């Protein structure tokens, strides 16, 4: 019955066109298992890797979302930012 806890380990920073390593380490479900991790990098791109690398084409500050869903189909969403400069 218990919702999963996502941990998105923000904030993130890097430079345009250089890969940034994201981590969902510490995410957990008290009464089950997390069966999916869904990242949205805020630049229209997504991943279902636990700990993806992603580069941003353009500078800016992007909203990063991590949606975790458990084995009973229940989800929760964590957010942070990725600040991309020169």
Numbering used by the authors: 685 to 770
Quoted passage from the original study:
Similar to the molecules in the holo s2a crystal, the four apo s2a molecules are similar (average r.m.s.d. of 0.5 ± 0.2 Å), with molecules C and D being the most similar (r.m.s.d. = 0.2 Å) and molecules A and D being the most divergent (r.m.s.d. = 0.8 Å). Molecules A and B, as well as molecules C and D, are related by a noncrystallographic twofold. Temperature factors for each structure are relatively high, possibly as a consequence of the high solvent content in the crystal (61.8%). The holo and apo structures resemble each other (r.m.s.d. = 0.6 ± 0.2 Å). As expected, the most notable difference between the structures occurs near the N-terminus, where Ca2+ reorients the interacting residues Asn685 and Ser686. While neither structure could be refined using anisotropic B factors, comparison of B factors revealed that with the exception of the N-terminal residues, no significant change in B factors occurred upon Ca2+ binding. Unlike s2b or s2, s2a truncates β-strand A through an approximately 126° rotation of the ψ bond of Ile692. To accommodate the change, Tyr696 packs with Phe706 and is involved in a Δ4 Tyr corner, in which the side-chain hydroxyl group hydrogen-bonds to the backbone four residues prior to it. In the s2a structures the termini are the most flexible. As mentioned, the B-factor trends in all holo and apo s2a structures are similar despite the difference in crystal packing.
